[PDB]
RNA sequence: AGGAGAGCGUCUGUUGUACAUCAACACUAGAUACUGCUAAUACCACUGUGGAGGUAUAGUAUAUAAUCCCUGCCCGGUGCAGUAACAUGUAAA
RNA sequence: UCCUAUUUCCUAGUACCAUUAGUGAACUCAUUUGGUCUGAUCCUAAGUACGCAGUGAGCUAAAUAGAUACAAGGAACUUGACAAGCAUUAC
RNA sequence: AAAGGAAAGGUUAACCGCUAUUUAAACACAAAAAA
RNA sequence: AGGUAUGCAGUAAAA
RNA sequence: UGGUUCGAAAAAAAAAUAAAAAAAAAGA
RNA sequence: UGUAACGGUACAAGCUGUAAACAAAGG
């Protein structure tokens, strides 16, 4: 295949995805998103 | 000819001679007034930034002036709102008219 | 698919400067406004309380000001009225506006009663004349007024284009070597005298060369900007309050008609 | 369509009320007294009681016909484009429809919930807004002033912005003689003047009406298109007979409300488009003929070179479409007194 | 690509007479590196040109041998 | 029904046709009290443009609809009826 | 859908202008952080209603209510005077934690009720052995902010902090030292002890964010010892990257004070550190808007009527000058208001004295106006002109600023009320003078 | 993947190791390999509590080793693999310097790979044109005023250690001779600011003639 | 194309930009500028020099250099130079245009209602082609082959052949005007 | 791709990507037929959806088409309409 | 005591993830030199005060694809003016 | 004329909602209840 | 003509 | 500077991810 | 249950879970 985990690509990451994809690595949470992007 | 002129001007730059240029008639190679159009755009951007700064200053000043000693107060309506609420039998009271 | 926005807007706008100039024209001169002149007046009611009250309390004035015909309204402020009107005139105006509002409220709810109709008619006519003395045919925007007064004309804009000051008196640390045309607008709807308009240089103009690159050749009001626009002896404080059917210009003095003025 | 308010709000077979009341008085008894006073005032003001006919409409139209500073100074507009008339002279408002009385139109593009095309030959067209027009005239015994007349892209007639005496704004269908500054009212005591809304039982014979309710209080449904109108033929205690624009004679309950006059914009039919592009803007798509297709695609298709229909005309679905009746035979006529015949027969007899 | 998943090997199955050398770009890059080293007192080009076991201090060479 | 703000009730209007009687001043009875204003606004919001009729078996004269009088079908198309192995879960489970 | 060509063009132009407006709007937001921190580990887990009747409140409830009101900016005079009455009733039954929270609320809200602090301080002194770091810090902090000066009690608080050094929080100790320096309450032995402890606290317990709070020019000039001065000035060069304009300003003022009054220490610094501060002197350190006060404006008006050219509220070096004359630039004036002294006294603040001495030694001829004397002139202009002329006819003030006569809280309150009345009258008769009032309408 | 950090640790398992970079790092900066799930606050607290380091800033990147295909050796299996592990590269800026020989790589075999020597004059990637934001001194707020060298206090602090006149820092081998202001010359030679000195005479403003045919 | 939707005026527009309608007076208006009594607030010049550009008329004696801060353009600014005002490919002779894809100078005119165009290849030389186009246009004008530039003599001369053609048409349709057929 | 003409389509358009760019299709308009609203017609889970939140100057179906003059005769046949069924009507059916 | 008020208000170090900020279809595709050339726009340009890019060697045969120049004749060619030709030529 | 944006947020207004709320950061400063 | 810097609810008006 | 986050607006779910771990006695 | 992703381990088709091959000798 040309998209996906095939050919050694593995699971998707924000580095390999378009802007808008949300995926972290396991960090703890330290706060709250506001209603205005903060 | 462009190559020759560039060589000469670069030679003067390297030598450190004064930054003089040929003064004669420069032909106009373009049609658009990009300089002035871009200047107008920059003017508009600067005005917008100034407006944002004014808005911020007014926001903070309004909050802080609202919270001042001798100005801020805790108040409630003089006449209890229970006395001024609509009686349950009022025609405009919810459920008292056909829908 | 993308969620880039803001400074990373994926929209491929044109870079052609001529097209962008046309866009400027369409976005500023040909912009469409939904609200009306009375909408703007209500938005500024807190600063123009007296005129808002008159517009809402005098019969016919709201109808006249809500008509489609492109109009220009010069709105005085309560501060302007208080400063320029005599105390008795201000008291009379407030009392009569309150009287009209009170009669309206009575409607919501001998000879002595008969005189009420005459007084109402008199007050309505006088206040309608006063309010409509500020309504002018056509839409006269601020830049149009300035260009009509001559600002922007290279032959006439002298005394407004090269203002300078004694710099060393105000920015001394940078000057060690020195340390040693009346346009006429159509008459108000309630009068026949056309309105004079002129321009002057503000006190802030002289300080521009201190902080800007210049290419020169060989009490005072605190309103901002480099140019001041005067209409009928009154200064424009906030202009280009555009609407769908006209424009509102805020002024610092009421334009009382000669008929309502007192000769002695 | 059903993409607006939900079924629970839109569907109600039996409406239990005909007067949308908005009383101001503190108690029900005082509200009733005020309603009686308002009805009596409307009755006192009402003076016209004669029928409103085609000839009276023509006379009013004739009377209405018989009876440089205003611009944006210093504003050089487009090089070629200009409005047909300035705002202070155009018949219509020239402005924008009220935002609080309209919403964006959901364009189904001729496709149903299945996603297939059910209504053929539909195109995107120009963006449109649906505006909330009061087909009910629910507010009774309160006078309103027509402030302006407005274009409607979904409707063949013109709309009128009505401001009630208490400040309420609404949109109603405009009559052929409706002009700014007109005073209108809905009541049984109202005079017989164009724009007024009355029960069909209080409108004299020969009068011309529009926006007729099939069920009392459910909002007018009959005679809405521009220039259309219906005529009052006969009246009895319970029913009133109307002749409709289709030449159909039908009875209506005497309690169904209606508005006096003809529907505005009677010149709609006179419009000439001039090019395919105008219909393209209006929202049409090309219509391919049945006989231009292959036999698998239409009954009329097939045949070397051009040919005739080769049979009595039928649609894509095999139904005769010239003279073949489609109304259900068993469906009762109900209040229909007589239904029109073919136009050829009508014009030849 | 480095993982050899593309089809770039298809063209390499056909002969070509030659290939561009990009010498202008490569020389600009090389001279940038040389300047970065030289501002600190390093003669990278001299080091690269030295013969095996050859020692030349400063800016010296066969001409220094000739005149000394 | 839309009720504009009490500080600007006057909507934009065209020029009144000649001879039209002067409109009386607006009666803003709903500005005496904020509670009255809110009640009136909610009452106005309760209004509806129209009420629609629909098939309902609870009504004595209700009815439903079948297919067209002629009884034909789209030319060249052999429509397959829905089944549990055809259009099984379109728009709803059952 | 499609649009008519005019509509297409107008909306397209609107979109372009919106994009450009956004770009212009975001231009100056260099110091706008989408990630922001909020402090909440001081909020108590108990719930309270601030308007509850005070007579039902105890220390634990009233302290929490005061702190919550201060956090929520519910600055109501009646509410806070009820707080004062109830707290004075409950003075006998407050723990150090409750007293600390009360002082925090009062200082944070800047509620200048001197009587409450005066009545609560004796119990603070008595209960000092049981106090903890936060409570000591808060008492000192509130007193410094509101200008309530009690040197004996402040010194006792500092001594208690020294005794509990092993338990004190570094930030609390730094704040206590700064407050002691600003209030001028430490004799030489206490100053030496505090400097010795602060040296170790900063070297062992404070990272950059905690250390930057120790950079205060008043403490450097009047309190810190020479080794502490050297260590602080050296460490600021390392910790500058994490600092803000206030920290930079105080570091610059400290360097100038050391250079002007301690040339030996300035020389004992190293060349690299001196270079750092020389380069700091060249930077544009963001100040904040300052404007003449009503008293400042009155003095300026009287001076102008006298006929002396002058300029107001300008920055020279790392100082702000109230009035700077134009004809003779070295002549300057300072208008001293109620907050320039300690409450109920005419004693100048340490910052004011330090600024006076530094400017005097750098060459300025300073003259000073006291509001206590100015208020007695009233609205008269001839009297004020004569006052300023007589002050001008006399020599400048010494490099050491001496305190004025004795006063009392009664006289302070009386003078504040008189100043209020004078402000009102002057504003009224300024605006009335501005108003023309010349249009007369024949409407009647 | 890595276990989430508890509120109280008592026994940290995270390994912070020094990373030898082939790129350039400043004097007071050091690069560390760290577990991917740690935050900047966690890293700073870890370093300040376990080592006592005085950390000023932490910057983070996520490094994923690139895909590699086994294609070369005899009997090659054309399978994909990654060398090393995914990790967080934490660049820590401290109060004191860190040795270059520690933080960066060196080589006498490939003479071009000496980042400690080449510094930021080279980009160590495919980047051709280096992007650098304006410096703090170049900014306006907390920036260096271009006329502060003439003020009294800076000159009082300078003493004999520093000379503040910018004329003394002019590079003779780069600047050109002063021209006559009355004759054609370039602005970029000696002005180095965005305005026109008054000593330059009045300049002619030329507006394009877009419709010559009309006249 | 000469659209009907382009703006009428071809000038560079500087619209009046009003501030949000409810902002109070800006900070720099509090300054006191009496020489005897001075107070210059913070950011006075920064705020005022940008507020002055609002009206769109007083753009500054050095516009747009007073709002152009980027050094990219200042590095290119020259002094005491004389500049042309006309794009080199524009001709003052009406009807002369340039087609760049074809590399030709075109002369477009109207002659007897018809719209006609002729090409002049520029590969022989830009100046030569442009001058050939201008000479052709002027020759057409002089000989009266451009309708709008014709003279009374040209109109009279052309009317003769117009008359001949009209008589031919009359003979063509003679049988209809007489009443036969 | 000029001047003078004829044929076919009025025209601007669509069009078979990769053998058909055409006289083929569409088109502005004139007609006819159906449809009184839970309208007809379409989709064919059918108290549902599009039609349409529209209402006979509307919607749907089938021809012929834009401008001018014209558009003859036939209801015997087939279909449709009409009636209890007839009679009778309807061809731009 | 003539400013529309003479109204305290700088940047709290800052969660997680993306980015090689330039030339360049840089995408789908693959006879894939990534980058030059093949088109508008983007810097008041003597081509933007020396920029970006430049691929083994030989050799007079014809034939082919083109480019230029063709005496006199001028469509006699061809199914058909297809293809060509004109639209440069004292200055 | 083919008849065109209004959800969240900011501004102004209104407001008897609430730590689901602006540093235990700092600067400035004639300033304020009751009696 | 998406949302800008104490933040959650919440009504109206609008370049 | 963007994503994230509120809205558009979506279980119309990007496996190994989160303001997202049993959810206030939190011990200030 | 089964499988897989990352991480550790000879950078692995094995083993294994941040204790990532080993505790067996504790009031």
mmCIF file of C-alpha atoms in Angstrom, chain B residues 84-86 90 92-95 97-99, chain F residues 29 33 35-36 39-40 42-43 46 48 51:
data_model
loop_
_atom_site.group_PDB
_atom_site.id
_atom_site.type_symbol
_atom_site.label_atom_id
_atom_site.label_comp_id
_atom_site.label_asym_id
_atom_site.label_seq_id
_atom_site.Cartn_x
_atom_site.Cartn_y
_atom_site.Cartn_z
ATOM 1 C CA UNK B 84 -42.674 42.942 40.701
ATOM 2 C CA UNK B 85 -42.875 39.485 39.113
ATOM 3 C CA UNK B 86 -45.922 38.715 36.988
ATOM 4 C CA UNK B 90 -51.501 37.172 34.329
ATOM 5 C CA UNK B 92 -49.030 36.781 29.535
ATOM 6 C CA UNK B 93 -47.890 34.308 32.194
ATOM 7 C CA UNK B 94 -46.701 31.081 30.515
ATOM 8 C CA UNK B 95 -49.472 28.601 29.780
ATOM 9 C CA UNK B 97 -52.936 31.580 26.377
ATOM 10 C CA UNK B 98 -53.534 29.179 23.478
ATOM 11 C CA UNK B 99 -50.407 28.258 21.526
ATOM 12 C CA UNK F 29 -46.779 49.676 26.316
ATOM 13 C CA UNK F 33 -41.574 46.820 33.059
ATOM 14 C CA UNK F 35 -40.865 41.458 33.314
ATOM 15 C CA UNK F 36 -43.707 42.533 31.025
ATOM 16 C CA UNK F 39 -43.280 37.929 28.868
ATOM 17 C CA UNK F 40 -44.404 39.747 25.716
ATOM 18 C CA UNK F 42 -41.737 35.047 24.808
ATOM 19 C CA UNK F 43 -45.404 35.240 23.785
ATOM 20 C CA UNK F 46 -44.586 31.329 20.504
ATOM 21 C CA UNK F 48 -46.070 30.101 14.064
ATOM 22 C CA UNK F 51 -49.920 24.614 10.521
#
